[PDB]
Amino acid sequence: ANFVSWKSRTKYTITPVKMRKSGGRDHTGRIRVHGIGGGHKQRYRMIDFLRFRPEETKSGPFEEKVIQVRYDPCRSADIALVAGGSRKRWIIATENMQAGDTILNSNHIGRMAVAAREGDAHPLGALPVGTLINNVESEPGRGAQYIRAAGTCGVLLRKVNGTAIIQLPSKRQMQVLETCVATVGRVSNVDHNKRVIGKAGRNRWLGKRPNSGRWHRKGGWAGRKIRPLPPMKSYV
Amino acid sequence: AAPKNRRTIEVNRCRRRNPQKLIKVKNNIDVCPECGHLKQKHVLCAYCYEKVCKETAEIRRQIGKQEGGPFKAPTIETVVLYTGETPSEQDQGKRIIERDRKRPSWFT
Amino acid sequence: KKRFTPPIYQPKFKTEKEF
RNA sequence: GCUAAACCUAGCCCCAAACCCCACCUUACUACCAGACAACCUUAGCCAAACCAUUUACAUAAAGUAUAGGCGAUAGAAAUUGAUGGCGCAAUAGAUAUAGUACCGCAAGGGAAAGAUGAAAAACCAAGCAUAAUAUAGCAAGGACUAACCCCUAUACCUUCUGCAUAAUGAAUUAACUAGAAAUAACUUUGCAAGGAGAGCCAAAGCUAAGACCCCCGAAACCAGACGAGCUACCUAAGAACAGCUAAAAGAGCACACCCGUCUAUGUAGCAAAAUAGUGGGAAGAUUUAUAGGUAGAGGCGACAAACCUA
RNA sequence: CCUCCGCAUAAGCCUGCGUCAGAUACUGACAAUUAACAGCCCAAUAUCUACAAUCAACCAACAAGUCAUUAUUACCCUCACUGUCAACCCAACACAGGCAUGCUCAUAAGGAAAGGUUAAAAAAAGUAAAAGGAACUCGGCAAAUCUUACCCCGCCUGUUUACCAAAAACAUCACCUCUAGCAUCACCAGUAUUAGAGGCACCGCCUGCCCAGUGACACGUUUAACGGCCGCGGUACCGUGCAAAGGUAGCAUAAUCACUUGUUCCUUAAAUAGGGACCUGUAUGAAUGGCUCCACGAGGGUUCAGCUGUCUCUUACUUUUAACCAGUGAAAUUGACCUGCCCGUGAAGAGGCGGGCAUAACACAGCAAGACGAGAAGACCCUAUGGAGCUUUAAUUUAUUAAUGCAAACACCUGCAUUAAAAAUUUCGGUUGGGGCGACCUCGGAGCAGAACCCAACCUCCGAGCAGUACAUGCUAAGACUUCACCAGUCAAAGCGAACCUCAAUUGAUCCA
């Protein structure tokens, strides 16, 4: 096939980017994932998951102003247009994030624990134990990859050594270098879990094609499986 | 239903040469005393009828020329006058159709 | 199973001939 | 006496010898702009083994020997030896070929037919019918007879079968075409003869040579490589359509266009290789639909109907 | 008189009803469609571009949306090329089909249902119909009217076998199970309130017990995984066995094996129908989801009332068809036919044969009893050491992936093993009172088969797949028998060497080990 990924943009921007649906088809053209196809046309809004990204020629902790909080078609959680210095950028909005709020992004790990305030980004080592976090990075400077869905909140359990233990929303524990940044509070759109589709048409709008009509026998995997919680996933 | 066997040429000849199939000789043909062409007794002579039809066509073309358009039928009688002929007292008050030829002998 | 035998068209040249 | 009949050369087959202006990869046949992308990788299967599973061929002589082999079907060496046309075709033949054209298919691809005067054109015969329809009764004829019929006798053919007039198969009919290939061992006839044969091989009358016996059409299939998503299944890009009324931001109701195809009738070689008329379901949505692109057969796609993927 | 239309653009086609001349909407020649409409575009490098649309204004949103530049550097000096026709395309055709868009919404544009006659049957379309009003029929199919109420299934809108099934099947919101801690080609430019693999099916009440077995996960757990959820003795409850638990709630003659038309009440004059019930199911039953229920359905039943030609019971008329006249002109089929009826016969249903009867010749229009009529080398059934699809817990494999372990190298790659996943190749014996099921398949004895031999049966009856004794139960060798072939199986003189086999069957080749 001649499939070329629409994700060719190289420069970050605030403008919604015109996407191209895949319908679950790989670059070879064959279906790789079923149940995807159609739905309302959407435009991608480039999200800056590296919350501590000091502006060019600048460094150190910096503040920003929340211009607005906007529904994002590409994400369960709604996003926020956060502007600082002479730049703007899309970020993941926390639960109680309103327009006009001030958001602090710092890389400083003080000897004491910073007073956690919802919406700000601090290194995990700077947070008090037990604070609710989101948009956690696997490695320092990698960028947020975990706890990004609507209403998801990780927990800061321990800060042994130069490492921090994070309870992910799936309850799995995660060891990360304390220098990696994570935002305070739970992700916005907390009531996303209580959304009623109502009609098959709404699923088709969202872009989920109906399940296959073929009847499958349920094997040994089907029965409820109670397992011990998996061990910590370490990144040190 | 389809034929169970081919019908022979003998049977076919019987069927298609049975006198019911054959054309019947017509004994009602006769010579027209006027022109001498053949005509069926009850039917009008083809030659004479064609003469009359052609003269009628000429007269009707003159009628159309005089009328000059559709829906202009006269409200008076019509008389056809040929070369060398003048309207009579009866012809007075009637639309005159002039034909540029001698009156046919059969026409009166 | 459904049985269908597609019609077979005779070549056009056979019937297109002219004096 | 009409359809028609014929015809001889266009060419072809097998051998020998010999080695063989401009435009055009973009939507080919399109004068004229920054590329970068580059090829190599065991054939398989049918089939035989009466299945199928290891397996199953792709000069002479040694020799069908050594060997291999579900040691079986079958496979099978080497050393060594020495090494100038036609008892062809002649227009259903011979090349498919007058031409890879016409035509058919989206494409890969399939694939025809035929012509006949003469030195000069600046010169009686197939079927089918008609001449000429038919006379009681009968496998259509035979014995006959003065006499066509009338009289008497007579259950078409082929194949298949225990057995067929069989109401079992095939056949309208004419013309043309259309189907028994060969080893071993024997037999017959020659030649020579304990030897024969123009190296090799055989031999306790054999050896050498010749003659003479082994068909045609037909599957569903299997595998390899191409070609196909202009139909249809689904998807991608960017478009278009949805009157009117009730209701009110509705996978809402009635209802056009539009999409579909519930039931009836007709049609069933049809207008149509799935239609027509009426009737009916939806008709602002999970809708319908124009354009271009994508997924390819050990596959794709599928609101699974084993659906659809050029009837 | 009709008008579905029609006129343009798109797409498609490619000169395909313009003129002249010849023929007999054809052939040859000549001519033609003129760009403004449309196509054919853009110099770079960076840098910008949160705020739909819907009369965009209130409003209401969700499915979150077609519409934008700047900065510097370059640069004008010189309107080409191509489509333009038509009665047109895809359907083998001048095919009643397919065919996007803008206007026209019945037309200003575009067309002609009747070749002529007659007015037979049968057939098609339509209209009208006395009295009755479903008495028709499987069924109110069709037609006519506009019409109530109760059930089953599915919640619903949707989807499906293009070309016999539109459904109760598939999907479906909702609920639930399982898997996954993660980024530069899908999932996803997403991150556990996410994504994927599934089951069931909105909602309401619920979803009972069981982990013994299989599977899966773990190093015991799991059933909203595959699945399962009882007896005995005594006279419902009193004791006992067994099991993992003994089917719980609910519903129940069900779309639920049979009994079946279950038994009753209602409904009808009459009901194998329908509805309501039952000590109604050892073959009901709970996300293999159970009950209830609002709406909805061309789904399947039943029904009030009306309606009507469905019918009692058919009739009349118009059109088409039809028949006749004219033109043009197929198809399957066809051994030949000089092609009768009755009875009998026969390859077990005669036009053709035997005995009777009948019998001038041919047309035309109807009919469908026969020509075992045409049509498709029957799709039913069997067979073939003929296929293919699918499933596996059929045989053979792991070449291929995924894991591991061992080497090799210092995670990857390579080689070797093991385990899974996925697959691949191939087969699915025979006899048989058709096939299947059952039984049988080899050997011996007795009858059938009385007397040389031999004789079938899914015929009648018995048995065998050893055992015992001996260790010359060694070696050789004439001649014979022979299970109707061969293979195999038998007996045996003489001789050497010695001493001084029983038994009816009591078994199995080759290759290969």
Ligand SMILES: Nc1nc2c(ncn2[C@@H]2O[C@H](COP(=O)(O)OP(=O)(O)OP(=O)(O)O)[C@@H](O)[C@H]2O)c(=O)[nH]1
């Ligand atoms: N067997 C055979 N002989 C041929 C063939 N063609 C040609 N010849 C022979 O060639 C010889 C010479 O032919 P010519 O035509 O007379 O002479 P050429 O042209 O010098 O001959 P080539 O060198 O063979 O071309 C004659 O003996 C021919 O018969 C062929 O096809 N087969």
Ligand SMILES: [Mg+2]
């Ligand atoms: Mg399902």
Ligand SMILES: [Mg+2]
């Ligand atoms: Mg074989």
Ligand SMILES: [Mg+2]
């Ligand atoms: Mg064979």
Ligand SMILES: [Mg+2]
């Ligand atoms: Mg050699």
Ligand SMILES: [Mg+2]
């Ligand atoms: Mg030829």
Ligand SMILES: [Mg+2]
């Ligand atoms: Mg003749």
Ligand SMILES: [Mg+2]
């Ligand atoms: Mg007969």
Ligand SMILES: [Mg+2]
């Ligand atoms: Mg016969």
Ligand SMILES: [Mg+2]
């Ligand atoms: Mg037969």
Ligand SMILES: [Mg+2]
């Ligand atoms: Mg026949």
Ligand SMILES: [Mg+2]
């Ligand atoms: Mg397409």
Ligand SMILES: [Mg+2]
């Ligand atoms: Mg509307």
Ligand SMILES: [Mg+2]
């Ligand atoms: Mg609606």
Ligand SMILES: [Mg+2]
């Ligand atoms: Mg099914």
Ligand SMILES: [Mg+2]
């Ligand atoms: Mg099926």
